[PDB]
Design an enzyme around this catalytic site. Structure first.
Site, PDB file in Angstrom:
ATOM      1  N   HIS B  41       0.856  -1.211   0.000  1.00 26.50           N
ATOM      2  CA  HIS B  41       0.000   0.000   0.000  1.00 26.50           C
ATOM      3  C   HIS B  41       0.887   1.255   0.000  1.00 26.50           C
ATOM      4  CE1 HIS B  41      -0.094   1.214   4.303  1.00 26.50           C
ATOM      5  NE2 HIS B  41      -0.275  -0.064   4.626  1.00 26.50           N
ATOM      6  N   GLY B 143       2.098   5.605   9.749  1.00 18.48           N
ATOM      7  CA  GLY B 143       3.507   5.413   9.379  1.00 18.48           C
ATOM      8  C   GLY B 143       4.097   4.205  10.076  1.00 18.48           C
ATOM      9  N   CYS B 145       3.166   1.178   9.639  1.00 17.26           N
ATOM     10  CA  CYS B 145       3.126   0.037   8.712  1.00 17.26           C
ATOM     11  C   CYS B 145       4.509  -0.416   8.275  1.00 17.26           C
ATOM     12  CB  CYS B 145       2.322   0.358   7.481  1.00 17.26           C
ATOM     13  SG  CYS B 145       0.556   0.285   7.871  1.00 17.26           S
TER      14      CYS B 145
HETATM   15  C1  LIG Z   1       0.027   1.972   8.085  1.00 20.24           C
HETATM   16  N1  LIG Z   1       0.983   2.821   8.013  1.00 20.24           N
HETATM   17  C2  LIG Z   1      -1.333   2.326   8.675  1.00 20.24           C
HETATM   18  C3  LIG Z   1      -1.393   2.009  10.168  1.00 20.24           C
HETATM   19  C4  LIG Z   1      -2.761   2.411  10.704  1.00 20.24           C
HETATM   20  C5  LIG Z   1      -3.081   3.906  10.526  1.00 20.24           C
HETATM   21  C6  LIG Z   1      -4.285   4.364  11.337  1.00 20.24           C
HETATM   22  C7  LIG Z   1      -3.983   4.110  12.788  1.00 20.24           C
HETATM   23  N2  LIG Z   1      -3.423   2.775  13.015  1.00 20.24           N
HETATM   24  C8  LIG Z   1      -2.879   1.949  12.123  1.00 20.24           C
HETATM   25  O1  LIG Z   1      -2.445   0.827  12.422  1.00 20.24           O
HETATM   26  N3  LIG Z   1      -2.441   1.638   8.020  1.00 20.24           N
HETATM   27  C9  LIG Z   1      -3.276   2.259   7.199  1.00 20.24           C
HETATM   28  O2  LIG Z   1      -3.225   3.464   6.973  1.00 20.24           O
HETATM   29  C10 LIG Z   1      -4.229   1.345   6.435  1.00 20.24           C
HETATM   30  C11 LIG Z   1      -3.852   1.364   4.964  1.00 20.24           C
HETATM   31  C12 LIG Z   1      -4.840   0.535   4.216  1.00 20.24           C
HETATM   32  C13 LIG Z   1      -4.971  -0.917   4.554  1.00 20.24           C
HETATM   33  C14 LIG Z   1      -4.375  -0.500   3.242  1.00 20.24           C
HETATM   34  N4  LIG Z   1      -5.608   1.755   6.612  1.00 20.24           N
HETATM   35  C15 LIG Z   1      -6.284   1.532   7.757  1.00 20.24           C
HETATM   36  O3  LIG Z   1      -5.783   0.989   8.736  1.00 20.24           O
HETATM   37  C16 LIG Z   1      -7.710   1.816   7.765  1.00 20.24           C
HETATM   38  C17 LIG Z   1      -8.640   2.186   6.841  1.00 20.24           C
HETATM   39  C18 LIG Z   1      -9.885   2.158   7.516  1.00 20.24           C
HETATM   40  C19 LIG Z   1     -11.198   2.440   7.125  1.00 20.24           C
HETATM   41  C20 LIG Z   1     -12.200   2.336   8.051  1.00 20.24           C
HETATM   42  C21 LIG Z   1     -11.958   1.935   9.345  1.00 20.24           C
HETATM   43  C22 LIG Z   1     -10.684   1.625   9.757  1.00 20.24           C
HETATM   44 CL1  LIG Z   1     -10.419   1.092  11.381  1.00 20.24          CL
HETATM   45  C23 LIG Z   1      -9.645   1.731   8.840  1.00 20.24           C
HETATM   46  N5  LIG Z   1      -8.313   1.520   8.960  1.00 20.24           N
END
Ligand SMILES: *C(=N)[C@H](C[C@@H]1CCCNC1=O)NC(=O)[C@H](CC1CC1)NC(=O)c1cc2cccc(Cl)c2[nH]1
Ligand SMILES: *C(=N)[C@H](C[C@@H]1CCCNC1=O)NC(=O)[C@H](CC1CC1)NC(=O)c1cc2cccc(Cl)c2[nH]1
EC number: 3.4.19.12
Lengths: 304, 306
Positions: B41, B143, B145
């Site tokens: 991603h 960040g 991830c």
């Molecule tokens: C990675 N860098 C990131 C970590 C996330 C960010 C938000 C807070 N905690 C985390 O662990 N992951 C991220 O941005 C991902 C990327 C998507 C999966 C390919 N997105 C989400 O985690 C994401 C999207 C949504 C939509 C609705 C509800 C929720 Cl809980 C979501 N999480």
């Protein structure tokens, strides 16, 4: 999101851990430059541990009574002195992995990372708070002594703790890296009481702010209070008194959430008086006092 | 004495963490030999994330669209492939700190250490269990991830986890190091359900044994039970059914303590039905299910890493 007991990365400290043997006693040392720091009780027999004259015991010992192994490499001990309750063993080799470091004596309520070691090898890393009675709730077996507690700031390791003993309550006591115990403890084989274990009030509050940032808000009330009204209740529950300086420390968390410390103090007051009715905050059925305001910001703004 | 949630020493893993940037997206990668592993991603914009065609997005990228920094060290990207939900970036330099390593897909109910990283810098280490619904209860900000989960065995690192997302329940999801998610999750900007969060029964029991080794015995009763009687209560409280194999795994803790598995099962049954009366076990007012039998033995015998 999420809120976990997080230790500092242990890499810079792993490189400094060595084994110190003297007669039958083996424990851990901290190798920094050309010096190994370990607990002076390494020079004791079980006989000596009861009423040790460390001054006299150390006189009977020679450089060659100390076996220092760094991994498989034997380090030559060329000197031995006693600073309070630590032995400084001068070795002929500077630890090439010596990181930038400080020794700090931490204040009660402050947290640090413990690298638990046996025979100079790391087993694991966990976070601990210096409790107000100068004990820590650790995980320490035989041979664990000389394991160290530390914080990391920029590239710099601040060593604040070296493990020496377990108390009858199953909690732990140790020194700073200059060999001065936290609290009233002595390195002698005797059951030693700590004080009553008061709760770090400013840490409970920080943790409640951690709770709000992570979406647990059920304990927020529209009530307020004064510092003096709060301290009057908290004292009754063996909570540390809250100072203006603690309110100032909580400021950033207060601003991130939009809840004044004194509004949160009013929330904690309800929680102390009515209990929690078996609801959880951040997955806990008890109030957590081992996160500093700093720990909470680190995790809820992303410091690295 | 003492029983703490303890992570593995993070030293061998710290050396493998790097920063991966693509356009404006930065996250963490894992540098082993001449390969960087990060979440695919990294190639998405906000406009793409909701329904990404990763195959098409990756085609618009070239080696030079990936900036990989290891501390200050610029790594030159000379190759890129997608395997499941990870990018393998081929770089011109072998990580000189590559430790002995395996990739393992861990089983539900198994624990590992998470090295939480931002911008390819380690911030901290904590222990996590792969829950039965294939989530973890972590602490992850934007960040984070590409942060990895791992076990250490001798000097060998078993990488089992790479962080990709948060779920609406506030729990975490990721892949193994071949890019296959644990559980039903997809890497798309979408609220995804985990199952019912069943409790790892074998781990609660191990932890009760940890409690007895550390002197907490108040919950030991005169009663015993059968596997079938225990599972009848367990099921009611979304506990995983206790199997004969779980009884076999608990043998050594049973023997070390001298409490029969079914005696401890009898204790857990009373605890589920009568609650804990606001007492604590190893400082907890809940039952802890994130220590394996193995975790309990390692910590209570004092096992170290070379
Ligand atoms: C990675 N860098 C990131 C970590 C996330 C960010 C938000 C807070 N905690 C985390 O662990 N992951 C991220 O941005 C991902 C990327 C998507 C999966 C390919 N997105 C989400 O985690 C994401 C999207 C949504 C939509 C609705 C509800 C929720 Cl809980 C979501 N999480
Ligand atoms: C260091 N290697 C060792 C660590 C201990 C060992 C016991 C379990 N856990 C630990 O934290 N420290 C050690 O053996 C010390 C050495 C003494 C200080 C000079 N001894 C004790 O911790 C000790 C002695 C007594 C007597 C009565 C009651 C208790 Cl709890 C005691 N602990």
């Amino acid at each position: 999101s999420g809120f976990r007991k997080m230790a500092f990365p242990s890499g810079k400290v792993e490189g400094c851990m060595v084994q110190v043997t003297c007669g039958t006693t083996t424990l851990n040392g901290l190798w920094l430059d050309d010096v190994v720091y370990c607990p002076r009780h390494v020079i004791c027999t079980s006989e000596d541990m009861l009423n040790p004259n460390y001054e006299d015991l150390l006189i009977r010992k020679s450089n060659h009574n100390f076996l220092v192994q760094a991994g498989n490499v034997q380090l030559r001990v060329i000197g031995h002195s006693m600073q309070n309750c630590v032995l400084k063993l001068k070795v002929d080799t500077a630890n090439p992995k010596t990181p930038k470091y400080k020794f700090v004596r931490i204040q009660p309520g402050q947290t640090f990372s413990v690298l638990a070691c046996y025979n100079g090898s790391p087993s694991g890393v966990y976070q601990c708070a210096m409790r107000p009675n100068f004990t820590i709730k650790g995980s320490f077996l035989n041979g664990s002594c000389g394991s160290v507690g530390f914080n990391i700031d920029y590239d710099c390791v601040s060593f604040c703790y070296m493990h020496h003993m377990e108390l009858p309550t199953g909690v732990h006591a140790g020194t700073d890296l200059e060999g001065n115990f936290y609290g009233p403890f002595v390195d002698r084989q005797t059951a030693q009481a700590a004080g009553t274990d008061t709760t770090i009030t400013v840490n409970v509050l920080a943790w409640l702010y951690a709770a709000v940032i992570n979406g647990d808000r059920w304990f927020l009330n529209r009530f307020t209070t004064t510092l003096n009204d709060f301290n009057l209740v908290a004292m009754k529950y063996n909570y540390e008194p809250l100072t203006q300086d603690h309110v100032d420390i909580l400021g950033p968390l207060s601003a991130q959430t939009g809840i004044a410390v004194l509004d949160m103090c009013a929330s904690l007051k309800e929680l102390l008086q009515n209990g929690m009715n078996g609801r959880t905050i951040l997955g806990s059925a008890l109030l957590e006092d081992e996160f500093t305001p700093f720990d909470v910001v680190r995790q809820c703004s992303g410091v690295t």
